Design a protein around this nucleic acid. Sequence first.
DNA 1: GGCTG
DNA 2: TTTTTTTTTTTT
Lengths: 95, 432, 432, 432, 432
Amino acid sequence: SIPWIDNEFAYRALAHLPKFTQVNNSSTFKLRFRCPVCGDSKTDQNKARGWYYGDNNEGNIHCYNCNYHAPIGIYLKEFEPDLYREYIFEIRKEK
Amino acid sequence: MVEIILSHLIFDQAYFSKVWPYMDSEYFESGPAKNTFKLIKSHVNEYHSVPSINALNVALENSSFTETEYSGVKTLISKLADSPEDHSWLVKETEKYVQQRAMFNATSKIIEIQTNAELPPEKRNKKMPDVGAIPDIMRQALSISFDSYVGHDWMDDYEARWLSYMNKARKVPFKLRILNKITKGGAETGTLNVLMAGVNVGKSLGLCSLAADYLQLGHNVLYISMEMAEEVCAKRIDANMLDVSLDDIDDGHISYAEYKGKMEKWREKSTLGRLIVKQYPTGGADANTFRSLLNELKLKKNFVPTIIIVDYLGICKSCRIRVYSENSYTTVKAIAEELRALAVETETVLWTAAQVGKQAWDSSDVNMSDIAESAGLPATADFMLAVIETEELAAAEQQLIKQIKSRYGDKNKWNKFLMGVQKGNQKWVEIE
Amino acid sequence: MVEIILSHLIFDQAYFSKVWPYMDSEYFESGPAKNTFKLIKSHVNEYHSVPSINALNVALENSSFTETEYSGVKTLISKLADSPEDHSWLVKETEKYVQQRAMFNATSKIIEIQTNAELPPEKRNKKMPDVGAIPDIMRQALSISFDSYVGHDWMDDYEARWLSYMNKARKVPFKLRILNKITKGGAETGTLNVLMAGVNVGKSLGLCSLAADYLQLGHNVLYISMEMAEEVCAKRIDANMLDVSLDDIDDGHISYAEYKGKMEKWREKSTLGRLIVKQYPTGGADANTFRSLLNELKLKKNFVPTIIIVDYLGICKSCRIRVYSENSYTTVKAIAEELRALAVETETVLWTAAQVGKQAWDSSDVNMSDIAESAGLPATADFMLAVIETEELAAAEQQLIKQIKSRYGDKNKWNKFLMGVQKGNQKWVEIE
Amino acid sequence: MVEIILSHLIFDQAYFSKVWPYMDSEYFESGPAKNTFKLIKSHVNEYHSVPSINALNVALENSSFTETEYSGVKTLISKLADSPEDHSWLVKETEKYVQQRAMFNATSKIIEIQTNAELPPEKRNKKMPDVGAIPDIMRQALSISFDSYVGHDWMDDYEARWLSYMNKARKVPFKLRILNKITKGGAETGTLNVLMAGVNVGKSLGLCSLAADYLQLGHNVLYISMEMAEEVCAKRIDANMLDVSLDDIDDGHISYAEYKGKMEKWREKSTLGRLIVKQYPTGGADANTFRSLLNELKLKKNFVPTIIIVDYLGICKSCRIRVYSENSYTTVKAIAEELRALAVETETVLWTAAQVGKQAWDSSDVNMSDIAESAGLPATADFMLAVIETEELAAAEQQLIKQIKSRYGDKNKWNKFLMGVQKGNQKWVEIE
Amino acid sequence: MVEIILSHLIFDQAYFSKVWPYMDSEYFESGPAKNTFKLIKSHVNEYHSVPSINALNVALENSSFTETEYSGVKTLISKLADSPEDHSWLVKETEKYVQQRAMFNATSKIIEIQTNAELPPEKRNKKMPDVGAIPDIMRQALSISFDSYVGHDWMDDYEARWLSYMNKARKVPFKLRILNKITKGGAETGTLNVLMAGVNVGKSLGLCSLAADYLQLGHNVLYISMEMAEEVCAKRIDANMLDVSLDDIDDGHISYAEYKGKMEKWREKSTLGRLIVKQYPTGGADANTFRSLLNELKLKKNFVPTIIIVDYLGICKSCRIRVYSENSYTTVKAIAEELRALAVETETVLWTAAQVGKQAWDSSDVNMSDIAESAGLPATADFMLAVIETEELAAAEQQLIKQIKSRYGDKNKWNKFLMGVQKGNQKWVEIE
DNA sequence: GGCTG
DNA sequence: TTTTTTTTTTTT
Ligand SMILES: Nc1ncnc2c1ncn2[C@@H]1O[C@H](COP(=O)(O)OP(=O)(O)OP(O)(O)=S)[C@@H](O)[C@H]1O
Ligand SMILES: Nc1ncnc2c1ncn2[C@@H]1O[C@H](COP(=O)(O)OP(=O)(O)OP(O)(O)=S)[C@@H](O)[C@H]1O
Ligand SMILES: Nc1ncnc2c1ncn2[C@@H]1O[C@H](COP(=O)(O)OP(=O)(O)OP(O)(O)=S)[C@@H](O)[C@H]1O
Ligand SMILES: [Mg+2]
Ligand SMILES: [Mg+2]
Ligand SMILES: [Mg+2]
């Protein structure tokens, strides 16, 4: 897999989601966001349990509220198809 | 010295020809070394040649590696160089390194096995070998070497073949001359011998007859019965040796005076061994329990057997596989391997009795495609016989032996012969 | 559980007589536990008896330890009580503890051997063994089971074996002379006996006949029905005992007066036992249900059954395997093994029926291979008789019984004998 | 009162004897209580004795749950202590607690089933029971009262048994004299009777004739057709009752006046029940479906059947085995067992049809071994009748009914008799 | 990879002559690589030869590029080396690179076509191909392969095929004149050849004779034995090669001196091959284990065989059959297919033997109809030689060889021939 | 204020 | 990898 293009594409997709924070240390890339599937916690409006982890082989999104866990490609295919088109195309561009 | 090994795999040819078939990915640490070896192995599998530095840098770019893995592999590839040394120290050093890595992997595996065993049921991992499988793993790791024998090479291995021609292995003779004829003098020490038969047709009768015959020859015989009580097996032996029918013993036809007289007459004979019958519950004994029994017999009774007899192979515990984990074939094959290993370790002729399938029951002829529990038993066994007392041999008080697998001689010479089974005395007499 | 082991070493002679043979200072710990065990071992060596708390404390005062170890030993010695736990659990738990500590010590030893092997020859210690000693080291730590019994000897124990020949308490007569003749004194306790036939041939008829015969001998019979109702089977038992008919009961030919008179006359007999009929839904019972039923029967009434009749093993449900987890050869054999284990635990004669495949439903003879369910049932069975009925036999009201698996006696002495089955009375009649 | 229950399970032998057989793991909690009871249950299963505090602590140390669970179990065990109590207050309170917990678990499962069935398919988390078995689960929550029925005693309970012979409410007489004669009073409630004919020989004509005969004898009949429409079966019943050929109805040889007159003449007769025909798609109805049909018939139509008829069991779906998972043998045996369970539950005479093998077609005789889909169906069926038709029999307007499995009487007597089937009127007539 | 491609275009000849026709400017880049390739192509067009580095730099100096383009091209030109990579890997990797770039270009072109299609018709480019041209364009991307070899093309490979007929590229001679006569020059590679042995003929004598003949002709022979050990088969080989009788070795007539002298005399000859004997248990070697054996021999022993001789086809086990019947037709047909597939995929001559039909045993003439394996062996066998040993032939030390199936040549040309079998030396000699 | 597989 | 039912087919 290609991790840096997943980090670049994931950011824009999760940028729309509110409570968006870039948890980027010296060796990891994570994105904190409110989960778009369930709206995160109904009682707490300030909780952002949706996370993106891009330091692995494949950048994966995981929600700690509704237990959603998916790759960034499936997330883009299911929710942002205009962003999904360029995402799968840019793969061939660099490969 | 992983860097040296990789460098001389890439830049040297005699070293590659000598060490490559024995290298494995598990011998390298999970860092850059294992990934670099993966690239080299993939290139060799795809092109049947040793890759260059350019080939690997192309393979690295065309790889699904993380940034850390990519950087480590690139640094390791950059660090590789052809240091001139001797092709007699490199090979031995590589062999030492591979042996050390194999021992390390075996130690980690047995530690994981012991950790898995102590876990409670319904949470412990399945298909993972039990504690009793630990020594066997440690026996495999010590066997790693850069020398491999695949088949017998004519004109390259002919001294050993001449030795095999001139020399003959020692044999523990039977008392029945027909078995000596079909085995060229008897059975060897480290062997697993099986007497397959149908249900209620004489599996224990033949084993008890063999035990009596060996006891009359001065051997120390251990009869491990997994299905019958100790008194029942000893009564079979008494009927064999005291020439009194089991009906006579049960009905009380023989008196205590005659029984004691016959027992003392047998005792006074110098050509007599010691027979010890040990009973275990069904599925409650394994090879390690047998080793504990042997240790206590040696320590507390000064008893070292030669003719260890197991009543039934299919009942004993696996000792390598957890109970109710694998299928019958795998479990029975593991039991056979463990029993043969025990026989080799103790230098004892081991005799057992498996059960044939339902098809072989009341069938005038049987073959290797009749074993019920496992067809891998003949491969593990060293001599295998059958019992074919189906319909009319019982009326004639006789039997039949197929000789399914005979490693001592040739099975197609006296393949089928008739045995005079006498069930009252629980013995085999010869038709001659 | 070192505290429990030490407490029951000091305060229990039965525990000391089975565990002290197999106990070492390496098994316990490196701190206060090892020092306490060393004090116990020193005291038992100097004086051949188990020490007391006062004697142990005096020895601790005599022996020399540093301050920390002295405090630890005093604290541990203070914590010793009788605590009469179960003996079986205690010995099993101490065996497990010894095995796990021995495995830990063996793993540490082989790790030390491997670490010493990598050292240069000048630096390495000559006391530690080579790597080639790794496997057997791991094997001697897998043969430390607690078992001091070695087994029979056939020459040192022939008096005890002859005395065992006179113990006929296991036999249970049949009330039928032919069955006693072919079983050499009837069935034995803790055995799985099977009565197999085709569909609608008289399997439950034979089971009820055996129940009535055992009832008339004074035994306690527990009939477990799996298809019929309790009142239906009791009707068959009434037809056997009162000896009138099955149709006459349902056709009103029996006046209440006669029924009451016959029942009271049978009550007056002192040779009559107790019969309890229990029904279960198909596929909903096994030994686990049977053991709870046994406990409830014993609690509610003074009823400990000597005979346990199961209407059919197939209709029964295995304990571990689910309703349809595996095929017939497994779960049927599992149910057979569980029933035999229940019988040998309760020391009761277990009777059950078995079905025959369609190939022998209309044949003049039936073989052991004609078992509808798993062929493991004719491996756990002990006296598997067979019922064969033809048109000529039904004309004479004489079912043929063939001896299929005879573990008690000679299977071929009286292989086929005719019975006098009366279907109206649900009774087997011997033929003379 | 979980602490009291556990404490008296530990420190009371009398309490353990009665409460234990019934105690289950789902009656305490999801935390410390369930873990402590699991420890106790494992110890009991391993040693058949009540563990002590030391044994519980040892098992706790050899357990794999987390720190919170370990601390909770340790506190709960430390809190266990025997108290001066009386057997009655404890048994009654335990019964109340167990009943309350059973009701709570039942209603939680009912809510889970309701909230699971209200989900889109393919995402409904299969292996969860459907809403149809919502009340049955509640029926299991009420059948827990510490009062398990040990069984029926032959001598202690015989007045109640005798008040079941002249009752005769179990038997439902036929209308044909020969069928009553062979069954000695007709079929019995809670049974499974079967017709085996082949393909296009009868076997639904016979079922319709039985339905008509029962309907004439003041019975409520529930015909269930898995392979024919509701109007075809009703047309067959009309042809049987009105004595008008099926050809006459097809060819319009009967007027509306005659049809109306015959129907009203039948209606005005007091000796006539109600027949209801229900159609299900092939393979789309099971025992649970039939129970739902029974409930909705009782409620909506106040119709309580006694002669429930199913056209073909082989065409029905098992309510336990997933479709096409097990072979024909297991699936058909399970379906027949479930149908018999339904029949005994609702106390109705259940009639069904079964196919024979291809080899039995166009044969002058049909044996029991010719059953098509399973050999277990004859074993799990109270009565079976074989319908045989040859060219000579067809030319004589007769069929030979052979008694294959006759559980109500002796099958050898009157094994084969010739019925006068009239195929035009879908009626069976006798020849006597 | 582009750097390597350009470097080996500049500094190689075979690579250039192989990959230049399939090299385009659009395959490289839009930057320095494209400019460098344009310079190379311009130079090769103006001067039909590969440019040198100095000439390339002169062309770059006399070219129209900007500052950044000049720097990029200069750096890339300075970064090209004459390093020696292997040709096969280079061609395969540049083919993959070209294919990937062509696919990317085609995908971009079709995306651009679709984007232009969704534009105001008044406003679009005319040069852009229509949407209907999309499937063809991708086809041109998929039709890119440096070397097209899909099967044998008639009229396009006739010159290569003629070189096969003249050079007899497929034939492997027999060393026996008669066998070469009837095979038109011996057996062929990728074939399965079997011998049919009538009653009284051994199957391993002929196979050992063929193995010895191939060994004397320089071929690598892999002899896989089933019913015999490696030493026994190699002893048969020694009997044939050293002219020593088989019984003389066992008796001890031949001493170590003569044996070693003959072996070293054979080793001196340069016309001798290698024989590797591998033993497998009966039924424990399918034609997938042989693939693993070949892989191990190639990797470790560097032994790549040209002749593979299996001791007996019947003893082997069919792959993907999960069964091993002693004498079943389905297995023999599958075993033959698997062995012939192995021969085809390994380009080796495969030999095996089978037993003829019992009728074939009695009759001196053997018909394809008279074969134990009917329609299974005379369907997957290129050559099936039949061996007949009657009393008169045995008295004359001869065996009648009959040709039952000859894919090689006409079966009826020389069907019957007499062979000089020597059973002591296990040899076949010709008859004048 | 983070936490998955 | 064996085991057992049922069927269908085919080969001897
Ligand atoms: N007490 C006895 N008296 C006479 N003959 C006996 C007696 N017990 C067994 N036999 C005979 O001995 C034969 C062989 O019995 P076994 O030795 O138990 O064979 P088996 O294979 O061990 O039977 P298993 O273990 O139940 S499969 C039986 O078939 C009987 O004919
Ligand atoms: N409409 C009809 N008119 C006259 N005769 C009929 C009619 N339908 C059926 N029959 C006769 O009734 C015989 C048996 O009918 P069925 O009861 O349907 O047979 P069947 O065994 O139920 O069919 P299957 O294969 O089990 S669904 C046939 O062989 C016909 O001779
Ligand atoms: N009510 C009855 N009156 C007379 N004879 C009967 C009666 N019930 C059964 N029989 C006879 O009993 C014989 C077989 O009895 P069963 O016990 O039913 O055989 P079984 O089927 O092997 O036992 P099951 O299936 O567990 S009830 C039948 O062949 C009938 O002849
Ligand atoms: Mg036995
Ligand atoms: Mg029955
Ligand atoms: Mg029908």
